[PDB]
Design a protein around this ligand. Structure first.
Ligand SMILES: CC(=O)N[C@@H]1[C@@H](O)[C@H](O)[C@@H](CO)O[C@H]1O
Ligand SMILES: CC(=O)N[C@@H]1[C@@H](O)[C@H](O)[C@@H](CO)O[C@H]1O
Ligand SMILES: *[C@@H]1O[C@H](CO)[C@@H](O)[C@H](O)[C@H]1NC(C)=O
Ligand SMILES: *[C@@H]1O[C@H](CO)[C@@H](O)[C@H](O)[C@H]1NC(C)=O
Ligand SMILES: *[C@@H]1O[C@H](CO)[C@@H](O)[C@H](O)[C@H]1NC(C)=O
Lengths: 70, 49, 22
């Protein structure tokens, strides 16, 4: 997929691309297979979702939520 | 893309390759998508000339 | 830490620590 839409905002990978074996979505580097969980760290936000062609609805995870409880 | 020169050919969507080639010169790749149509119509036009 | 050879114990700071009281 080119990008992922969460709340109308469109996200892009900091480096590498998104893939999925059907079960879940992942972000990986270019020359070697090494998936990692999607995050607001290795992604960035720019513009709304409507403009881009071929976007896919999903959810972006934020690791700060479990930590801010303490 | 470039990969077939390096080793075996790997399929890749064309818009993705355009985005990479934009990264190659220092323009954040999102700029490509929010203008895709426009760029295309220039390419087909420019080659026409 | 299992695979890489030469790995060393050390304390890694986190900027969240001073402000975790929120
Ligand atoms: C068909 C299949 O095996 N999908 C798995 C998925 O269930 C698992 O959660 C993920 C994390 O290892 O890797 C992949
Ligand atoms: C074609 C499609 O998927 N449209 C959905 C829309 O129905 C939904 O309101 C929005 C937020 O959930 O994400 C998108
Ligand atoms: C790929 O082709 C199908 C058939 O037209 C189209 O529905 C789909 O939008 C295309 N996928 C992307 C990302 O453009
Ligand atoms: C570096 O070389 C010395 C001598 O062979 C050896 O004792 C030591 O294990 C080596 N250092 C590491 C981290 O392996
Ligand atoms: C590094 O941390 C682990 C976990 O406590 C510990 O077992 C290990 O002994 C430490 N390494 C050294 C050289 O002490």
């Amino acid at each position: 997929a080119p990008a992922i839409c969460h709340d109308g905002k469109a996200h892009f990978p900091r480096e590498g691309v998104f893939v999925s074996n059907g079960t879940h979505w992942f972000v990986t580097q270019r020359n070697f297979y090494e998936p990692q969980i999607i995050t607001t760290d290795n992604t960035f936000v720019s513009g709304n979702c409507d403009v881009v062609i071929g976007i896919v609805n999903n959810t972006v995870y934020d690791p700060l939520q479990p930590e801010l409880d303490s | 893309g470039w990969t077939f020169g390096a080793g075996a050919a790997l399929q890749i969507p064309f818009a993705m390759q355009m985005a990479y080639r934009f990264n190659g010169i220092g323009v954040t790749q999102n700029v490509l998508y929010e203008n895709q149509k426009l760029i295309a119509n220039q390419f087909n036009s420019a080659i026409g000339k």
